[PDB]
Design an enzyme around this catalytic site. Structure first.
Site, short mmCIF file in Angstrom:
data_model
loop_
_atom_site.label_atom_id
_atom_site.label_comp_id
_atom_site.label_asym_id
_atom_site.label_seq_id
_atom_site.Cartn_x
_atom_site.Cartn_y
_atom_site.Cartn_z
N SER A 1 48.68 44.90 38.92
CA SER A 1 47.99 45.81 39.72
C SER A 1 47.52 46.98 39.22
O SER A 1 46.92 46.78 38.31
CB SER A 1 49.18 46.30 40.84
N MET A 2 47.92 48.34 39.13
CA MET A 2 47.41 49.45 38.33
C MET A 2 47.71 49.10 36.76
O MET A 2 47.12 49.81 35.77
CB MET A 2 47.60 51.02 39.02
N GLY B 1 51.42 51.07 40.48
CA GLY B 1 51.79 51.75 41.48
C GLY B 1 50.61 52.66 41.94
O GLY B 1 49.64 52.23 42.67
N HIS C 1 45.26 42.26 42.25
CA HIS C 1 45.03 42.18 43.79
C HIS C 1 44.48 43.36 44.40
O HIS C 1 43.81 44.18 43.70
CB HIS C 1 46.32 41.90 44.28
N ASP D 1 47.09 38.08 45.89
CA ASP D 1 47.80 38.42 44.64
C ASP D 1 47.33 36.92 43.63
O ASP D 1 47.44 35.97 44.06
CB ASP D 1 49.43 37.99 44.88
#
Ligand SMILES: CC[C@H](C)[C@H]1C(=O)N(Cc2c3ccccc3cc3ccccc23)C[C@@H]2N(C(=O)NCCCC(F)(F)F)CCC(=O)N12
Ligand SMILES: CC[C@H](C)[C@H]1C(=O)N(Cc2c3ccccc3cc3ccccc23)C[C@@H]2N(C(=O)NCCCC(F)(F)F)CCC(=O)N12
Ligand SMILES: CC[C@H](C)[C@H]1C(=O)N(Cc2c3ccccc3cc3ccccc23)C[C@@H]2N(C(=O)NCCCC(F)(F)F)CCC(=O)N12
Ligand SMILES: CC[C@H](C)[C@H]1C(=O)N(Cc2c3ccccc3cc3ccccc23)C[C@@H]2N(C(=O)NCCCC(F)(F)F)CCC(=O)N12
Ligand SMILES: CC[C@H](C)[C@H]1C(=O)N(Cc2c3ccccc3cc3ccccc23)C[C@@H]2N(C(=O)NCCCC(F)(F)F)CCC(=O)N12
Ligand SMILES: CC[C@H](C)[C@H]1C(=O)N(Cc2c3ccccc3cc3ccccc23)C[C@@H]2N(C(=O)NCCCC(F)(F)F)CCC(=O)N12
Ligand SMILES: CC[C@H](C)[C@H]1C(=O)N(Cc2c3ccccc3cc3ccccc23)C[C@@H]2N(C(=O)NCCCC(F)(F)F)CCC(=O)N12
Ligand SMILES: CC[C@H](C)[C@H]1C(=O)N(Cc2c3ccccc3cc3ccccc23)C[C@@H]2N(C(=O)NCCCC(F)(F)F)CCC(=O)N12
Ligand SMILES: CC[C@H](C)[C@H]1C(=O)N(Cc2c3ccccc3cc3ccccc23)C[C@@H]2N(C(=O)NCCCC(F)(F)F)CCC(=O)N12
Lengths: 182, 186, 187, 184, 186, 181, 187, 184, 184
Positions: B91-92, B62, B116, B165
């Protein structure tokens, strides 16, 4: 849109080499104006064409469709700003034949930097940013050539919305004369 | 419906886990989730500065700044923060998985790790788009630099591998340096 | 879901437990509700102890300028030093409140993001109504810039120029600017 | 309102079609493809030897609709000149490159953009697989033809179309997408 | 409204959790996975040897959230019994099959359904390729585990999960998804 | 729109040098009226033109397109307010040829200050505010010249919505005569 | 924006001019309105000349099966050979109509796309209502597959297998399959 | 606004659960099934011999959710009495018939409705076929069990549930859906 | 919204301690389930003492109304009914259902009676089934109203054909209540 004896009013004006840019510039408006310019050249390559401009601008690429067609054809395309010329409308106003760019006394000319959007990955945003920045460089270089103002001056003057009177537009080099009532 | 457990003292299940120094990152990372997790981290190091903390990660990531709130709090506090990826870390979330104490970053065998680029957007003037572009590019360089330090991979390799990705298995995440061990059944 | 903790046996939600040790959370967009809560917490803590420090956590994108000034004025009036720490991000009125912390006790963690820019607003209706709205927001900007000048040590001229567009700063750049005093480093 | 010209009344675009000019001035969908294909067929029947002029100011659109126009251009006897005015993006730039050899043009400030095909898929894993294989084969098809039309390698086309790639008129000429930048 | 029981007041599900019963009675998302994982961890800590009972009335849902539950079941020491009541579809049926060997059950009129993973992809051709490769790998991972726990070949699992495949409790037993159909004492 | 023997009713009026401003003023309406004015002066530069005005106003720039075209061309452009003229419509009513600005007895005339909007940064709001204030000075300066009232009086009387009767509009200087039966 | 063409005089819209030379355009999604138009054009052309070929252009994603069969049955009933040419794409009932052209006169241009798959539909309500809808769409598929088998030369078993999922074919693959007779290669 | 009863504070439904009363008073979904199944498991654990009382005022709903409750009722040792108050429709009527033999009741003005299961299908012909075979097999399952519970034939149940079939309490007793109509 | 009174009680729970039940809303299944549970609780506490049913309701579901009706008639205690504000449709039916000689209304309370409302959509035979159902439901309601008011079924049919508003005094004369409760 009224009829005159059989022509609609705008088609009657086109008979006397008058083209109306009286709306927001999109691809459809560009396609029409480019087609009108090509037709008028084919009828007579010597006689002047008159481009009426009452437009808030719009698409830059659609604007350049009109711009490049104006510069390619043999006839001088006169430009006259009536009401308002904003953004790409003011760019096309400045693109008229040298000495034949006009505005009526209370016409409004606005110049400002191009608008756009970008969404997605960092590298996609970078590509979009580089594109719009290069597009601004292209617009500023041509406007510099057309007005006689420097690229640095145009950059600073278009950073925010910059409204100009007809007389101020003449002083800037966007037009040649403020057309007074005879 | 979050279930209650009675040890008398009643606890909701997550608060009972917090009693044993377990924090849950089980949702999309926004400011509210960051505020809760950093507060839990501050509470636990205050309770005991020596004992390990356990950060559960089942998150699609997020907000980057919300993630860095958690990241910076983990690195500042004295206790080791163990990270365990269960389900997925994207991601995060995968960034925070890699930010756990060296030698104490884990994933279960079928957990999914994805890395990514940062995502974002910008609308308005050309100079406004430039500011947004420079900001997100600087944010990516910041993330990739830290990932390089945490994984042992070069910044050039991180850049290439995060261009699109990039889904990794638990074993692939270990080979990459995002985790230290794939946790197997005893 | 806000987790519960027990001090062995008084039960507290995590934020209420932090408030017991004089920690206030500015972890959301600043509106009147957030300002009322933070102002009330500041008034409560100073009433308990007027000499001990208060710690204001800041992870906020800013928001209402008037709601921000509710928090600002309360911080300056009370006797306790209110420490500020930026964790995650401080944007707009959040970064203004970060700079408003006690002298020498304004902090940011190394990867925290600080953003400064001019105030946002709107106006619609008659020309004289637009003029009033325009004069109000310009005067509000001068008010913000003057106080930010006092807190940072930068000039009003520099702040005006630097806040014309969105200006993102690193924690170290925020220290150099005077928005914070130190970047809190790990041991 | 599209303006009229009388000399026999014509809307401006129909008057242009009388002189073998076809307008691709919109997003390419099936309706635009059907119209342009029909105009090309008509102009071939009128005169099999005289050149046709395809104006391109288009952001592209449907690949299949684009290939309807492409295949019709390649089948008919007359040379189809292409001229980029304003912008040619995606399948618009593909059709720009598909004009008669030596007769592909762009005006100096016209914009050319090339990138990979866009699409979507939803449902079962095997349904997503079918959709992925289809769009990948469609990209190979497009890149193979673009390689033939530009003289660039398929490997270079693949790399250069991975992301949005904006080209100036002069860059499009240097790339092989057009033959000449038409100067005033 | 969830009814309360007082022996110490409990909501009905929390009372069941006191006797090592976990309820998977909804669509599987990250929230449900976070809760079930936490309950499993809590029950292991309470007693590492006593059986846990996982009730399954679920249409499935998120595969990664399902694998959070799956991996937690396999890691912990206690046997997790699974009982299908009502229906187990998709990732629900996967978790039914993941129960302790010899302790996977269904009631006589319970419904089991197996099919392939569902998903989506949008954007560039290479982005669709990545999404397609990802979901195909996820199906391979699911089918390989299902093959191991049912005793069926990957070939057969692939064919039988191509479309929606509804099974009775007795058919689920024959297939190897469960061990016994639990019959009522007359 | 009925036909008359073959002309549509508005096109038949245009044959006798009558232009209809019977709607909200946008760029499309301005483009049409400007084109009609240019057509009629080209046919005959001496004979008068009759501008029918039943309009609530609208765009100021679109209004100034019509205004400047009226002032430039040789023919006297008569203005007749029938029904209502508000905002830019009342500006164009006052812009007609001197001694040839009319209104029917029960026609409504309204004057107020320009309307607009602004959103975003403080400096963007400032630019928008300065623009609309300059636009008001421009309108008030011209209205002062057309009516004979002082700019201070125009400023005060246009501060709020100011409805006028046809007779009050004549007294104010916005028209020359109330056209009686 | 359909262009007009004039020939010395008589003005035609482009599609009506093509119809004068016995060309019918199937260039959209197939619904009852499109079927009504095409059936009427076919009836008109056969009345004008029962011997000369008709040319059916197909750039269509398909659509209604019953509307498709309106066109199919009209093609087969009338005396003139109806040539079919796929340009751009023929999908679903569009590809069925492509295969329905006169034997030896079914064409595609080299980059035209052909797709074959199952009939699509839906049903909501009682179990017996769902049964009726299921039997109907299954019977419709048998009907389509049987005709495809006859016109392609492939077995019904093979058609069933190859139409189970979305099956994209090149022009050449469509020729090999028997959906068309020739790929029109450019000179 | 659920009223409180003191008494030891209880909400009214929890107070009823103390005396082995379970409320099926809503549309049957998975949440309602989970709660009712949990209550049945709790009550049999407290006492495996004493009767349980299932109040039914429900329009039915999910068939699988209903079978969750059905199978739990049949497995546990205690007799589950059913009483229809207000209305039992569709899967609510099925569960009314599932109560202990001799202990299925309805009040005099209670409404019982039986009809075939409802559902949907969308997509490919073979997908519609799978959905159709599934709902048809589910109807056979429901009818076979309802035949066992009522003593009526599967053939009779099929015909009687083809359309919406409203029954009075006395008609439900005659049918075998309940055993007695409880009079004052 | 709901204030507390001090053992702490919300105002409605405090009233329930003195055998007062509130029907103060539109009648749906949730309201019926609560009221029948309250009625079952109060009779279990004491089977001799009266229950007081407050009615301020516009009516609603007929089956949910009959859940309350049948529970009132079955239990041993007299259920007094008092109309305060308004009783419309199934609310006025429940007002009339109170114990004989113990049905009340305050002087300015409104009582409305009218025929059942419903809907039907689909095939002709489906509309027929729905029509027969609602007609049979009206006969059921009118037959019970006739028994409890003393009016003939023919008179109830005619008077409920359209919306029929009654004063408290008119409701007493009709037989819907026994007395208009006056201020002492
Ligand atoms: C300046 C244009 C050139 C003469 C050249 C050309 O570059 N082009 C390319 C060209 C365009 C081509 C199609 C559509 C629009 C075009 C606009 C152009 C603008 C500038 C330069 C070329 C353009 C075509 C032009 N044609 C006509 O204008 N034909 C006469 C018909 C005019 C009308 F009456 F029908 F309107 C077709 C033949 C031709 O050689 N050209
Ligand atoms: C590592 C924390 C530092 C020692 C320092 C600090 O940097 N900070 C700043 C700081 C934060 C301040 C407020 C809110 C969150 C904070 C998070 C931080 C994360 C890292 C570093 C400092 C943080 C505050 C800390 N406080 C407590 O933790 N108090 C104990 C609280 C117990 C309980 F309440 F948690 F139980 C207040 C006193 C204090 O000096 N600090
Ligand atoms: C700094 C406070 C001042 C001494 C003064 C005041 O200026 N004010 C004004 C004042 C406020 C008044 C109401 C609500 C919020 C206020 C916030 C203030 C912030 C700064 C200064 C004054 C404020 C009120 C203060 N009160 C309390 O704090 N009372 C004790 C409250 C204890 C507890 F509840 F917090 F625990 C009421 C008495 C009083 O004289 N004042
Ligand atoms: C190159 C065209 C071929 C000679 C052949 C053909 O391949 N086709 C197939 C064909 C199409 C058929 C229908 C619609 C569009 C078509 C586009 C085509 C494009 C390329 C090749 C064939 C096409 C048809 C063509 N027709 C005409 O063009 N007739 C002339 C009248 C044209 C107009 F004036 F009416 F326009 C009908 C007769 C005919 O044999 N053909
Ligand atoms: C199987 C658990 C291991 C023993 C190990 C671990 O791998 N992990 C990692 C781990 C998780 C960590 C956090 C959240 C969820 C976790 C789920 C896991 C599932 C499987 C394996 C490890 C898990 C944590 C575990 N903790 C507890 O369970 N503590 C007891 C308190 C439980 C309760 F009562 F509070 F519930 C914290 C200490 C610890 O070392 N571990
Ligand atoms: C007042 C007109 C001026 C004399 C001058 C001009 O300034 N302009 C500029 C001009 C306009 C130009 C284009 C469109 C609208 C215009 C409106 C104007 C209004 C006022 C002044 C100039 C305008 C054009 C004018 N043209 C015609 O009107 N031509 C004949 C029109 C006949 C018919 F088509 F209407 F029937 C073209 C040649 C020309 O010299 N001008
Ligand atoms: C092949 C047609 C048959 C000979 C027959 C027929 O079956 N039918 C039935 C029939 C249709 C009838 C109406 C509308 C469409 C029809 C389509 C048909 C397609 C196939 C077979 C019969 C059709 C009608 C046909 N008509 C015409 O076509 N008349 C000529 C007018 C043509 C046009 F110019 F008007 F088009 C009317 C007289 C007639 O006997 N028939
Ligand atoms: C009839 C139940 C069996 C005895 C068996 C079982 O089949 N099952 C499986 C089973 C379920 C399991 C989990 C959740 C719901 C279940 C519902 C069932 C319904 C019918 C049959 C088995 C069920 C579990 C049962 N458990 C309890 O009931 N434990 C007591 C819990 C009491 C309290 F919490 F409710 F108070 C856990 C141990 C156990 O062996 N079983
Ligand atoms: C008049 C009720 C009968 C006595 C009988 C019955 O018919 N029924 C059936 C029945 C219902 C059953 C469940 C829920 C609601 C019910 C409402 C009823 C209304 C009328 C008649 C029977 C009802 C149940 C009753 N139960 C209790 O009331 N138990 C005590 C409840 C105490 C407390 F919880 F309320 F405080 C359970 C045992 C029992 O035999 N019955």
């Amino acid at each position: 849109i009224p009829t005159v004896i059989a022509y609609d009013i705008y088609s009657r004006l086109l008979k006397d080499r008058i083209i109306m840019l009286g709306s927001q510039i999109d691809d459809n408006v560009a396609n029409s104006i480019v087609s009108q310019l090509l037709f008028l050249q084919a009828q007579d390559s010597e006689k002047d064409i008159y481009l009426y401009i009452n437009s808030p601008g719009g698409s830059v690429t659609a604007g350049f469709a009109i711009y490049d067609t104006i510069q390619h054809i043999k006839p001088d395309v006169q430009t006259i700003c009536i009401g308002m010329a904003a953004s790409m409308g003011s760019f096309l106003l400045a693109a008229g034949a040298k000495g034949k760019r006009f505005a009526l006394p209370n016409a409004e000319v606005m110049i400002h930097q191009p608008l756009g959007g970008a969404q997605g990955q960092a590298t996609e945003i970078e590509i979009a940013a580089n594109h719009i920045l290069k597009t601004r460089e292209k617009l500023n270089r041509i406007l510099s050539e057309r007005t006689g103002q420097s690229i640095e001056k145009i950059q600073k003057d278009t950073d925010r919305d910059n409204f100009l009177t007809a007389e101020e537009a003449k002083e800037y080099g966007l037009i040649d004369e403020v057309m007074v009532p005879e």
